[PDB]
Amino acid sequence: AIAKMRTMIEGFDDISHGGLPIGRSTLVSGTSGTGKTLFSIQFLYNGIIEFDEPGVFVTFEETPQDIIKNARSFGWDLAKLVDEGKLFILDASLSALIERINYAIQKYRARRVSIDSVTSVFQSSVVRRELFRLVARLKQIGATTVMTTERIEEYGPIARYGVEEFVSDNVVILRNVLEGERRRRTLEILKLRGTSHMKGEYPFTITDHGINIFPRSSNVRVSSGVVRLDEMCGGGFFKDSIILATGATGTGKTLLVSRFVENACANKERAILFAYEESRAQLLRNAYSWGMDFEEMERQNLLKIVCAYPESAGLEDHLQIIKSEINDFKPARIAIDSLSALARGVSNNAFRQFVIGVTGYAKQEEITGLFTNTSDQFMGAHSITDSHISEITDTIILLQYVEIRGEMSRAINVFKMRGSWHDKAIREFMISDKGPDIKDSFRNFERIISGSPTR
Amino acid sequence: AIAKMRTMIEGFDDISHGGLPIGRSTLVSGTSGTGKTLFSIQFLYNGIIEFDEPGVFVTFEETPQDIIKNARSFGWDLAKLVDEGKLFILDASLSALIERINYAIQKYRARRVSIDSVTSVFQQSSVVRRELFRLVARLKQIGATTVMTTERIEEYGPIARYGVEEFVSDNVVILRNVLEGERRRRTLEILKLRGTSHMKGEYPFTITDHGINIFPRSSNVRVSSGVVRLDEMCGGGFFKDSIILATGATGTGKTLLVSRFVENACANKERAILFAYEESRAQLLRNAYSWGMDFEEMERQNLLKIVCAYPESAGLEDHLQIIKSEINDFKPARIAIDSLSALARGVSNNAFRQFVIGVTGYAKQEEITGLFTNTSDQFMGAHSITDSHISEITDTIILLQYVEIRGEMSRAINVFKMRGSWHDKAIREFMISDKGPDIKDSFRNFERIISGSPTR
Amino acid sequence: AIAKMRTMIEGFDDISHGGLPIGRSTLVSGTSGTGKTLFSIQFLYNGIIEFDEPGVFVTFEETPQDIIKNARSFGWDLAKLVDEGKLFILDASLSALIERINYAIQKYRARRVSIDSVTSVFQSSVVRRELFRLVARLKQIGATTVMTTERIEEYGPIARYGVEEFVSDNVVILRNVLEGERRRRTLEILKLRGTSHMKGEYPFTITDHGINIFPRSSNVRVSSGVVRLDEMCGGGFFKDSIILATGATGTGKTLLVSRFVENACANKERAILFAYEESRAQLLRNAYSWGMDFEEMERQNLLKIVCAYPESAGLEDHLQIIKSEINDFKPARIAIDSLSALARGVSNNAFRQFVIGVTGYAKQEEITGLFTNTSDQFMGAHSITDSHISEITDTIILLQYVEIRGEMSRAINVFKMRGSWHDKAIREFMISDKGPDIKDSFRNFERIISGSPTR
Numbered sequence A, C: 001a002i003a004k005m006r007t008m009i010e011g012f013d014d015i016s017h018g019g020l021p022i023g024r025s026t027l028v029s030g031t032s033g034t035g036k037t038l039f040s041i042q043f044l045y046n047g048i049i050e051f052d053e054p055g056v057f058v059t060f061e062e063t064p065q066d067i068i069k070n071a072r073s074f075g076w077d078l079a080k081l082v083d084e085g086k087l088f089i090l091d092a093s094l095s096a097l098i099e100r101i102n103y104a105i106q107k108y109r110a111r112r113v114s115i116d117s118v119t120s121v122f123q124s125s126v127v128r129r130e131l132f133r134l135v136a137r138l139k140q141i142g143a144t145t146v147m148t149t150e151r152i153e154e155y156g157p158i159a160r161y162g163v164e165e166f167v168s169d170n171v172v173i174l175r176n177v178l179e180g181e182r183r184r185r186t187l188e189i190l191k192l193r194g195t196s197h198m199k200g201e202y203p204f205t206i207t208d209h210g211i212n213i214f215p216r217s218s219n220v221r222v223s224s225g226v227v228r229l230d231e232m233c234g235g236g237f238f239k240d241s242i243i244l245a246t247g248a249t250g251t252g253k254t255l256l257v258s259r260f261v262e263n264a265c266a267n268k269e270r271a272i273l274f275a276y277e278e279s280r281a282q283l284l285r286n287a288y289s290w291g292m293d294f295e296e297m298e299r300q301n302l303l304k305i306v307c308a309y310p311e312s313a314g315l316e317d318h319l320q321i322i323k324s325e326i327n328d329f330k331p332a333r334i335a336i337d338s339l340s341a342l343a344r345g346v347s348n349n350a351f352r353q354f355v356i357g358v359t360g361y362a363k364q365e366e367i368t369g370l371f372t373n374t375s376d377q378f379m380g381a382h383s384i385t386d387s388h389i390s391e392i393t394d395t396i397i398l399l400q401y402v403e404i405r406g407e408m409s410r411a412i413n414v415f416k417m418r419g420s421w422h423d424k425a426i427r428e429f430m431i432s433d434k435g436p437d438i439k440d441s442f443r444n445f446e447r448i449i450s451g452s453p454t455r
Numbered sequence B: 001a002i003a004k005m006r007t008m009i010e011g012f013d014d015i016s017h018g019g020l021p022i023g024r025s026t027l028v029s030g031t032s033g034t035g036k037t038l039f040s041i042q043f044l045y046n047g048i049i050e051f052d053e054p055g056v057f058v059t060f061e062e063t064p065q066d067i068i069k070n071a072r073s074f075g076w077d078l079a080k081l082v083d084e085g086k087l088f089i090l091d092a093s094l095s096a097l098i099e100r101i102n103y104a105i106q107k108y109r110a111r112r113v114s115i116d117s118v119t120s121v122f123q124q125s126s127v128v129r130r131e132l133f134r135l136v137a138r139l140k141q142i143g144a145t146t147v148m149t150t151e152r153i154e155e156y157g158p159i160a161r162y163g164v165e166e167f168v169s170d171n172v173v174i175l176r177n178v179l180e181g182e183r184r185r186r187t188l189e190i191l192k193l194r195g196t197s198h199m200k201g202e203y204p205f206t207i208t209d210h211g212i213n214i215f216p217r218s219s220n221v222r223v224s225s226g227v228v229r230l231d232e233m234c235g236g237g238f239f240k241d242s243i244i245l246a247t248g249a250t251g252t253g254k255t256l257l258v259s260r261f262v263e264n265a266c267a268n269k270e271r272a273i274l275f276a277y278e279e280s281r282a283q284l285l286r287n288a289y290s291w292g293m294d295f296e297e298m299e300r301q302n303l304l305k306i307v308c309a310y311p312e313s314a315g316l317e318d319h320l321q322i323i324k325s326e327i328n329d330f331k332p333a334r335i336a337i338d339s340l341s342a343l344a345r346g347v348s349n350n351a352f353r354q355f356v357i358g359v360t361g362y363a364k365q366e367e368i369t370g371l372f373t374n375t376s377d378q379f380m381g382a383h384s385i386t387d388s389h390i391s392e393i394t395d396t397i398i399l400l401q402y403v404e405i406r407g408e409m410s411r412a413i414n415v416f417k418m419r420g421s422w423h424d425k426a427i428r429e430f431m432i433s434d435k436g437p438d439i440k441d442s443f444r445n446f447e448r449i450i451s452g453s454p455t456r
């Protein structure tokens, strides 16, 4: 069994089942601006911070000073690490470098090594023979070195001369796929010789913290803000549960989200509202029109509002922003208004994967999550059957328009409630000031799931 | 930290989170006629017309005079800036250029540099890297923010010509001119920025007389839509800072509402703009007058402005830039787009969504009331409002549907929704006469009136 | 501001916002038989005919005589232009040609120059240096020269060595895209250094007139041929208006087109009928069966019939044929039977673009246009909602079958009428000799928009 060295890169320790094979070199190929350099530095930096192991960085293009300046954007003082003798930047911008690098290892007792764009150290029949020799010389030193190669295509040759993969024992591919004029940073482990790992691409983002690779069940009940909804839900929602508010435009998804967010602040509980449709300006006015002062809850430091457009950033970023905000603010409950706004111009695979990330994080932090969804057919019940994100929600609140005698009346019903009794009736509710009012159901009307009930 | 220098290019300053890394070489690769030269010029020009910094431009193909003449289309007098010593066009049409460029550094405290078509300086990969790496160093030591312009053959292939001008550069900017079904779409993206952060993915930009134009409250004041009943159904009227939507089948009366909405503005001595994409200026004046509203009168009062043209004519990138530019000058109190459906014909849903967001943002960020009309692609109408991905951004939805009543095609209107306001939740039947919309009562006897064919 | 020289090529003067940059060379790349030669000649010819400016043509492959023979197919006597000293064919089938061409310019005082397949003058590192030198020598002469390059792919390298685009100040691409075994001639302006222009491809055709690049509102009312329809329309159709007759096969679209065309000839007005379904033979018989002598109106020189198959020619050609016919005959009104026949096996983008061309030309000539369309679902009302060409028509006449007591009765209704009152009732009409008869509506029948009304 080959031992692995923790890279201390959030995620990579789980995808590589521990980390990188010890005493063996790892290839980190990718297109320009994928994060081949950031990874290589972050690996060494983390090593000379956690495990307190010496790390020698071999540069081939940019100067040893520019690397420290660029790395200063993540708050990593590389000069202090070089001043303490915990890092050695070998300015090399092939046996010469081998002995020069070999000496530097024992000269500083280095445990981790990182080569910067080994592609430039050959500016295919010769690359193999050279790369093979460098892979061997580092194997004899027993130093976990990380190799950086370049690629032209995102779905073509792994390396440049398409031979730097068979020469390496481990292969990590960094991708920046462009889909619908939106860049998506993906990291995958192509191979790991001697050990196991997770296969397929994995959504990652680069922030001020560096690379962010992103690979209970109590009977405690919380209030949704509506006494009738709490009665219909059989004593309100569960604490560590995901609720879903589906319905056609203008049904009252935001109203419910608002009331659900207010109820938290009422019990002095912190709450976050992620808006992707309306603006805080419009949100404050609309909310106030339902006898609810959102500015008040923002002044009590209980409610936090963060609105932004869905086509603005990527799903990978959107998720990172949610987690980050939740980590700082540490809310009791959160609300996403809405999921249907984040799925527009996105692949169903990347949306599903995104939705799994928020619900997983909300459920694994005992946070109540109210996710709103706009129906794409009038019959909202038929929109729930297609919705492949209804198999992840525990509670489903369905809002549907009902054509009643040449009038557009509304209707609410607890479509489902996991491990809890709920009212299985389509109750008619109106909207006014200081919020809504759930009345009775249309017992004398048939096919009320169509949006045009019959007498 | 890496300090960014403002380029004063509308959009790029926000997309690159400040601008271009200070004392670093930025690559700007792109196909022929993408706006590489224009960018490199606009960067320097803005540098000597804002932060008063002497910029040294380098040429490898076209003459220094042609560049001065070519930039005369945007209204930039390079000759005056050259004579003033606030610009140096070094004519170059290996280490020699470095020395001359290195000499031009302290020659006049040169802060901004710009090299054009560097590709031609190695058109007679292994050698291209060694040379490209050298320039990056000589300029890096000079401590001057230079802009490198490379050329590319494929719009979605190699970044540069030898696919090595990106790994040698600290920053990479890609200029695109993709052909979206016999329609060119200019896009700008920041591939990377060694040091700082930036916005990811391609960003719709347009070129005009101003140059490159990269295109990345909530009061309870109510305004009239032209109809008293419609104002009463909206619980007083439309919100000033709100986006209204008129959806319905062809010949429902979307343009009628748009006209009455634009009239009401001019009635209160308010300025209005009508963006027509279906009917002609002359056609709009005849139909309007047939309802009892003189449009020519409103054009003579300098209150209402009519600007109609075909949707297949220009692209969404341009169409939006026109609305913005025409709004900036005229400064309307309220505008109307008739219609959005006419602008979504032979257009990617992704590029259409981005358009509506860009237009609804501007109307909302300028306290302008916007009535956007949309022709429903189904008889149900309400079913079309469900597909409508633009109905989530809309605040008020005015639905217009037909109703087969006793072998007669009668019209019906209803306020589908009204954000942070009460509205009449009834399907009121209305008729059109020689004076405008006449809203009557709803159909209490009839059932399934959302279908388009009810029953008692 | 760079001044532009009018090429006098129908369309190019509007797409290039005036014409080609004066004193600068323009590239006209394209595949074999795109019209690179025709353009180059037509540019010079027009110059030594309108502006009366000398023009020197530099040939590199075919002889100076063959060019005159080929150009004789458009009725351009190049020998007469050479005999008058207004054209000089420099048989060149690189500094040698420069001086030879430079002399010829001042030797004839030429204002426009055209090089024939500059690609053959290099039969990539060398092409640039050569092309750059030729681009400069012509710039010093201050002569608006037009360069012709070749390409292998229609959506690949702009030129052959993919470097003749960055060397040129202006780039015009000629395309002959093959889509569904149908060739579509498209012209686009890739770039114009120093000035503005129209972007994207533009449908053009080659005829006997050469390249044909194809980039009011009175209350006057005309009769449709039916007194009931005129009453239902509120005093007949408008003069400068586009009417639409939609309905399922065998509803009476042709009957209406015929009657509408007859009414013109009745008031001694010229009319054109563009048939794409039935033949003039079948049209004359079917028409005569409705008490209408089409041969009579053809003998009075009032009605003109021109039938042909939709898959025969391209939309670009079909439009050119319509315009040409209208220009000669100068009709008062025209009818297209039908649009649904011209949209079969065509892209919706090219159909839309085609439909915009006919309606624009008909509306900009005070000509009444009756365009018929066959519905693709039984519910014709639902076929009008999909129809993205219903937002361009001012009047819509909908014909729908109605299942009435085990009988297939017909029904007509004025679906819409811009700036005019119309009868908003589904009137039942039968068909017989000397034409149709509109009766009353089915007031005791419900869901008559389905095609199966209920009692």
Ligand SMILES: Nc1ncnc2c1ncn2[C@@H]1O[C@H](COP(=O)(O)OP(=O)(O)OP(=O)(O)O)[C@@H](O)[C@H]1O
Pocket: A247, A248, A249, A250, A251, A252, A253, A254, A255, A256, A277, A289, A290, A374, A431, A432, A433, B391, B392, B393, B416, B417, B418, B419, B420, B421, B422, B423
């Ligand atoms: N003061 C009010 N009195 C009565 N009804 C109101 C009032 N304010 C809003 N409404 C009703 O509630 C609706 C707004 O509810 P909300 O904004 O939550 O809808 P939604 O279904 O979330 O819409 P979206 O499609 O934007 O997500 C209005 O369209 C209207 O029907």
Ligand SMILES: Nc1ncnc2c1ncn2[C@@H]1O[C@H](COP(=O)(O)OP(=O)(O)OP(=O)(O)O)[C@@H](O)[C@H]1O
Pocket: A030, A031, A032, A033, A034, A035, A036, A037, A038, A039, A073, A074, A117, A206, A207, A208, B166, B167, B191, B192, B193, B194, B195, B196, B197, B198
């Ligand atoms: N402070 C920061 N916050 C967020 N993202 C950042 C930050 N600094 C850099 N980035 C992102 O990371 C990228 C830097 O990655 P890196 O320098 O490792 O590139 P690379 O993959 O090695 O490419 P190349 O080898 O071609 O230079 C930037 O282009 C940017 O997208």
Ligand SMILES: Nc1ncnc2c1ncn2[C@@H]1O[C@H](COP(=O)(O)OP(=O)(O)OP(=O)(O)O)[C@@H](O)[C@H]1O
Pocket: B248, B249, B250, B251, B252, B253, B254, B255, B256, B257, B278, B287, B290, B291, B375, B432, B433, B434, C390, C391, C415, C416, C417, C418, C419, C420, C421, C422
């Ligand atoms: N003078 C009039 N008297 C009565 N009804 C009229 C009059 N003028 C127009 N109409 C009616 O109004 C319709 C025109 O409305 P409008 O031009 O707003 O259409 P729309 O709903 O915008 O649809 P589209 O843009 O597809 O034509 C006519 O089709 C007719 O039904």
Ligand SMILES: Nc1ncnc2c1ncn2[C@@H]1O[C@H](COP(=O)(O)OP(=O)(O)OP(=O)(O)O)[C@@H](O)[C@H]1O
Pocket: C030, C031, C032, C033, C034, C035, C036, C037, C038, C039, C073, C074, C117, C206, C207, C208
């Ligand atoms: N009299 C005519 N009427 C209509 N079309 C014509 C006529 N004469 C020529 N054409 C069309 O124009 C073409 C001639 O174009 P031209 O000779 O300019 O080709 P080209 O694009 O220069 O190609 P190449 O350089 O490969 O010869 C013919 O192939 C035909 O399609």
Ligand SMILES: Nc1ncnc2c1ncn2[C@@H]1O[C@H](COP(=O)(O)OP(=O)(O)OP(=O)(O)O)[C@@H](O)[C@H]1O
Pocket: B030, B031, B032, B033, B034, B035, B036, B037, B038, B039, B073, B074, B117, B207, B208, B209, C165, C166, C190, C191, C192, C193, C194, C195, C196, C197
């Ligand atoms: N006044 C103007 N108005 C609008 N567009 C203009 C104007 N002037 C130039 N353009 C546009 O910019 C293009 C020229 O831009 P520029 O010269 O920067 O091209 P480029 O990307 O550097 O190409 P290349 O390097 O191949 O010459 C023209 O083809 C045109 O599309």
Ligand SMILES: Nc1ncnc2c1ncn2[C@@H]1O[C@H](COP(=O)(O)OP(=O)(O)OP(=O)(O)O)[C@@H](O)[C@H]1O
Pocket: C247, C248, C249, C250, C251, C252, C253, C254, C255, C256, C277, C289, C290, C374, C431, C432, C433
């Ligand atoms: N002499 C006649 N008497 C009665 N009905 C007739 C007579 N001639 C034709 N018809 C009716 O009219 C129809 C022909 O009308 P027309 O050719 O205009 O139909 P259309 O809807 O235009 O068909 P297409 O699908 O070919 O476009 C026949 O199918 C029949 O129902």
Ligand SMILES: [Mg+2]
Pocket: A036, A037, A117
């Ligand atoms: Mg790097």
Ligand SMILES: [Mg+2]
Pocket: A253, A254, A277, A337
């Ligand atoms: Mg909402």
Ligand SMILES: [Mg+2]
Pocket: B036, B037, B116, B117
């Ligand atoms: Mg250029």
Ligand SMILES: [Mg+2]
Pocket: B251, B254, B255, B256, B278, B338
């Ligand atoms: Mg309209």
Ligand SMILES: [Mg+2]
Pocket: C036, C037, C117
């Ligand atoms: Mg030819």
Ligand SMILES: [Mg+2]
Pocket: C253, C254, C277, C337
């Ligand atoms: Mg027919």
